[PDB]
Amino acid sequence: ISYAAYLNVAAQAIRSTELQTASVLNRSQTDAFYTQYKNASEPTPITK
Amino acid sequence: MQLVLAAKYIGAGISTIGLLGAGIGIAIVFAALINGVSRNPSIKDTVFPMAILGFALSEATGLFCLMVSFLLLFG
Amino acid sequence: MQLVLAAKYIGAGISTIGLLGAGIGIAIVFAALINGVSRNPSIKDTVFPMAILGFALSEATGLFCLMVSFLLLFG
Amino acid sequence: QLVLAAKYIGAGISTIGLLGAGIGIAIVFAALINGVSRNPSIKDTVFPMAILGFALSEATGLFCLMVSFLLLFG
Amino acid sequence: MQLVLAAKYIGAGISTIGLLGAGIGIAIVFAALINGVSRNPSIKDTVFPMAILGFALSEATGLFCLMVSFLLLFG
Amino acid sequence: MQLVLAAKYIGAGISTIGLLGAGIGIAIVFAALINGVSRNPSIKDTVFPMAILGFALSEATGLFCLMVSFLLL
Amino acid sequence: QLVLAAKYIGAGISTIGLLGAGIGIAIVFAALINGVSRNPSIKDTVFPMAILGFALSEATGLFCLMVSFLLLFG
Amino acid sequence: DESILLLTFLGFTGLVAKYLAPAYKDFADARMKKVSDVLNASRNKHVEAVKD
Amino acid sequence: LQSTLDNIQSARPFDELTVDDLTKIKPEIDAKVEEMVKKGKWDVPGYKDRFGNLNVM
Amino acid sequence: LTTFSLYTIIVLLVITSLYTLTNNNNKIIGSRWLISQEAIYDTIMNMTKGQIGGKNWGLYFPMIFTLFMFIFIANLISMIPYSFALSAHLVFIISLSIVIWLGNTILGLYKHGWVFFSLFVPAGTPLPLVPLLVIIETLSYFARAISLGLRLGSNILAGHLLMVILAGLTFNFMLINLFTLVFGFVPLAMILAIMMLEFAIGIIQGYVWAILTASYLKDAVYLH
Amino acid sequence: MLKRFPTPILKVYWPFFVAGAAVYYGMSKAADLSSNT
Amino acid sequence: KLQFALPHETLYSEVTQVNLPAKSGRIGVLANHVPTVEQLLPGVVEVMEGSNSKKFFISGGFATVQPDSQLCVTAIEAPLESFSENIKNLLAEAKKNVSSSREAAEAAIQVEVLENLQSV
Amino acid sequence: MPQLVPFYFMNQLTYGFLLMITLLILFSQFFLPMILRLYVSRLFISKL
C-alpha cells in the first residue's frame, strides 16, 4: 500500500453529493487485470 | 527592633526575585503567537483573544509576588 | 541606624536578581520574530506590531522589579 | 563598619542578575542563525531586526549592572 | 577591618555566579551555527563572521560580571 | 583573623557555582555536533572544527570562575 | 571554631555545582539517541564523538567536586 | 602598570598589520577596479554609438 | 561626426578625472547634489545598479 | 590645560583629516582610505532609509552619521593605553543621550500634538487595561531615555577598567617567583584578547546607538 | 576640495537645540552643586 | 502566482493567499514563502486571490513553493460545493465496511473523508 | 577616581557640546555632500 494509494481512495471518495458527471464517475471506475508475469511463466490475470 | 525594621525591608527584596518567573512566562506566550501566525497567516483573529487571556493570567501570578513585596516593604 | 541603612544596600542587591527573568523573556520574543519572519518573509508587516506589543509587556515585568529596587535604594 | 560591609556584599548579590542577560543575547543570535539558515534570503531584513533585539536584551542586563555600580560607588 | 575585607571576599564570590549565563550563551550561538550549517551546507561563509559577533557579545556580558568580581576581590 | 580566613573559604565555595554553566555549555556544543552529523551526514568534516572552537570558548568562561576559586584559596 | 565551621560549609556549597553536570551529561546522550533513531546508521561515527563530549561535560562537574574535597580536607 | 597595557597595544598593532591590512588592501583595490571598469565601459559604449 | 570621434579620442581622462572638471563642464553636478541636500533625500537613485551598495546590514 | 578639552580637540582633528587627507582633490576612481568611508556612508544611508524612511530620513542622515563617527573615534582614542577618555567620561555621553531623548519627546509632541499620549496606547487591546498600558508604556518610554547612553558608557568604561585591573595583577605576576614567570606570555595574550574584544563592543555599540536612536526617531517623527 | 553645500538644519533641528539649552542650564547647576563636595 | 493543477483540471494553474491542509497541520502561503515541498493531506482548501476566495475540497496531493514564487499545488480531483448529505449516508455504510474487511485502511480513509466532509 | 567620579561636569559639558555642534555642521555641509558628489559624478559618467 502506498501514500498515493491512500490519495487514490480519497479521490474515489470525493466522487461521492449527487451533483456528479459521467466523466467524474468514469475517472473512478476502470477495468483491468494485472497479469503478474514471471521468468515465460505468468500468474493469472488477476483483476486490478 | 532595628533588626525587625531591617527584616521588613529585606523580605521585600527577596520577594522581588519572584517576578522573574512571570517575566519568562510573558515571553513564552508571545513567542507562541509569533510562531502560530507564521503557520496560518490568518489564525490571529481567533488566537489574539486567547493570547490576551493567557497574558493576563501569567501577569496576575507576577502581581501576587509584587503584593507580598509591597506588604513587606511599606507595611 | 547602621543596620537599617545596611539592609537597604543588601536588599537592593537581592531585588536586582528578579530583572534577569524579563531579560531572557525579551530575547525569546525576538527569537520568535526572527524565525517567524524567516518562515514567511511577507508576514513581517503584520507581525511587527504584534512584536512591539509583546516586547513592551515582557519588558514591563522587569521594570516592576527595578522599581522595587529603587524603593529600597532611595527609601 | 556595618554599612560599608553591606555595600560590598550587596553589590555581589546584584551581579547574579547579569546571567539572564547573557543567556538572552545568545537566544537572539541563535535565532538569527536559524532564520538565516532557513531562508537564506531573509538576511538583509532580519539583520537589523536582530541587532535591535540584541540591544534590548542587553539593556535589562545593563540595568542590573547599574544597580551593582550604584551600590559599589554609593 | 576584618569585616570589610571579609565583605569584599564574600561579594566577589557572589559575583562569580553572574558568569554562568554567558558561558551557556556562547554554546547556544555555536549550536545554532552547527545546526544552520548542517541545514544549508553553504550558508557558512556568510554566517561564520556573524556567529563570531554573537559570541563576542555574549562573552562581553560575562566580562562585565568578571570585572565586578575583580573589583570586589582585589579591591 | 578568623572572620577573614572563614570568608576566604566561603568565597572560594561560591566561585565554584560559575563553572556549572560552562559544563552545560560544553554538552550543548557536543549535542549540536551529534545533531548536525546525524542530520547531514557529510557536513561533519567542516562541522567538527566548529564544534571544537565552540567547546574551547565555553570552557574559557568556566576557567575564569575556576581560577577565581583558586585565588581565594 | 568559626574557621572549622566554614570549612564544612564550603564543602557543602561546592556540592551544589554538580547538579549542572547531571543535566549536561543527559543532554549529550539524549542527542545520541535522537540522532541514532533518525538515521540508524550514523551511530558508528557518532559514538566516539558522544564519548568525547560525555567526558568533557563530566570534567566540569569533577572540578566542582574537586573544590568540595579540597575545601573539606583543607 | 600601564606599561603592561602598552605591551598589549604593541601586540594589537602587530596582529592588525598581519591580518587586517592585507584584507583591507584587497577590499580597497577591488572597489577601485570596479569603479574604473564601469567608467571605461561607459566610455567604450558611447564610442560605439558614434560609429552607428 | 569625424570631429566627435576625434574629440573623444584626443580628450579622454579615463585614468583619473577630477569632479571639478565635471562641475566645470556641467553645473548639473553641483545642482543635483544641492537639490538632493535641499530635498532631504540623500539617496542617489540608480547608483546601486551600476555601482556597489557597500552594505554591512 | 584640561585633558578632556585637549581630547575633544583631538577628535575634531582626526575627523577633519579623514575627509581631506584621504584622497587628493577628488579623484573619481577612489583612494584606498576613502573606500571605508564610502561603505560607512552607504550602509547608514540605506539603513536610515530603512528605519525612519520618510522623506526627512536624509535630513537626519548627517545627524546619524555624526552620532556614528563621534562614538567611532572616541572609542579608538580611549583605546590608546596612556589616554584619558571622553566617552568614558559618562557625563557627556549620558547627557547627550538625554538631550536626544528630550529632543525626541519634544519632536513627538510637535509632530503628534496632544494626541502624543496615543503613542502610549501601544495597540488596540481590551479597554480595562488600556490605562495600564499607558502607565507601563510611559515607564518604558523614559527607560529608553537612559538605556541608550548608559549601554555604550558602561561597555567602554568597564572594558578599560578590566584591562587595567588585569594589567596590575600581571605586573605582580611577573614580579613574583620564577614558576610564575613560566607561562608569562599567557596573561599578556589574555589581556590582548580582551583588548581585541573591547574594540568590537565599541564599534558594535556605535551601530547599536545609531539603530536604536533611529528606532526612537521612527517613534518621534511618525506615530509609532 | 571642501565646499559648502547648505543643508537646512534650523528648521530641522530646533527641538534638539531647545533641549540642549535646557539640559545645559540644568547641568550647569548640577555641576556647581557637585563641585561643592 | 500559484498553480492549482490536477490531471483533468487546471483550476488556478495574481494569487495572494492560499490556505491548505498539509502534513504540517494547516499552512498558509502568502507572497514570498520559504521554498518547501509538503504533501497535502485530504483537505478543505480555500484559495484567495485578493480578498476573493474560492473553496475547493481536495483529495490531497503535494504542495511545493518553488523558489520562483510558483506555488505548485497538484492534487487529483477537486469545487467544494460539488462535493457537498447522501454522501454522509454512503460514508456511514463505509464506516460499517471497515469492521468486516488493505480494505481496512481503505475504509479508514473513507472515515477520514467523512470527518473532512463533516468539516464541510 | 578621575576616570570614575570627577566634579568637573559643567567644564566638560561646555567643551563637549561645542565639539558636537562643530562636527554636525562640518559633516553636514562639507564632508558628506562631497561624498554625495563622488556618487553623482560616477553615475553621470555612467549615464554618459
Short mmCIF file of N, CA, C and O in Angstrom, two decimals, chain B residues 39-41, chain L residues 26-28:
data_model
loop_
_atom_site.label_atom_id
_atom_site.label_comp_id
_atom_site.label_asym_id
_atom_site.label_seq_id
_atom_site.Cartn_x
_atom_site.Cartn_y
_atom_site.Cartn_z
N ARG B 39 2.47 30.17 10.76
CA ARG B 39 1.90 28.96 10.21
C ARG B 39 0.73 29.24 9.32
O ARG B 39 0.68 28.74 8.20
N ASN B 40 -0.24 30.07 9.78
CA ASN B 40 -1.51 30.22 9.09
C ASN B 40 -1.54 31.37 8.14
O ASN B 40 -2.42 31.40 7.28
N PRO B 41 -0.66 32.34 8.31
CA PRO B 41 -1.02 33.72 8.04
C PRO B 41 -2.31 34.33 8.53
O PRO B 41 -2.54 35.46 8.11
N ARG L 26 -2.01 23.01 9.24
CA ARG L 26 -2.60 23.82 8.22
C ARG L 26 -1.61 24.90 8.02
O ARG L 26 -0.89 25.31 8.93
N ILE L 27 -1.47 25.25 6.73
CA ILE L 27 -0.43 26.06 6.21
C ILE L 27 -1.12 27.09 5.40
O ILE L 27 -2.12 26.82 4.75
N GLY L 28 -0.55 28.30 5.43
CA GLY L 28 -0.98 29.39 4.63
C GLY L 28 0.27 29.80 3.95
O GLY L 28 1.35 29.80 4.55
#
